[PDB]
Amino acid sequence: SMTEEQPVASWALSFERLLQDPLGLAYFTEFLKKEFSAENVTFWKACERFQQIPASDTQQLAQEARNIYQEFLSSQALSPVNIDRQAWLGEEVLAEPRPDMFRAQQLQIFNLMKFDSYARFVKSPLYRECLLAEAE
């Protein structure tokens, strides 16, 4: 009935839950940083950060847009996220920043890590340490 939920176990039930829960995302990002492939989750975080901004404050949108752009979306990006660049917006997203722009690209990353880094995390430490210790 969705009235109650599992403890940290809920992560292994749904990636959404893992990705919506601060603890889940934290431990997940604790692994995903030391080897530096956090670009996906932090891009999703960036787009989430972008949609967090009220469409009313287009100025903040403009600021965040150029941030995410130069970091992940630039041709000289320090963290090049793998999305369809060929048909990507480009200068247009700087021209008109709106909190619905990177939506498809956001879900592109979401589904990218959904069956990969997620699938790995539930097998990796930190999860178990917060889930159980006696095993059975």
Q: Is the domain 1-35+117-130 a CATH 1.10.196.10 member?
A: yes
Residue 117 near residue 65 (C-beta atoms within 8 A):
no
Q: Is the domain 36-116 a CATH 1.10.1040.10 member?
A: no
Taking alpha carbons only, the member of 130, 124, 117 closest to residue 42 is 117
H or E element in which residue 95 lies: helix 91-95
Taking alpha carbons only, the member of 53, 38, 25 closest to residue 109 is 38
19: tokens are 């990705």
Other beta carbons within 10 Å of 18: 22
3-state per-residue secondary structure call for 35-82: CCCCHHHHHHHHHHHHHHCCCCCHHHHHHHHHHHHHHHHCCCCCCCCC
Technique used to solve these coordinates = NMR
96: tokens are 């008109």
Residue 27 near residue 127 (C-beta atoms within 8 A):
yes
Other beta carbons within 10 Å of 43: 28
Residue boundaries of the structural domains of the chain: 1-35+117-130, 36-116
8: tokens are 């940290």
Residue 31 near residue 121 (C-beta atoms within 8 A):
yes
107: tokens are 């879900």
One-letter amino acid at 102 equals F
- Same fold yes or no, 1-35+117-130 and 36-116: no
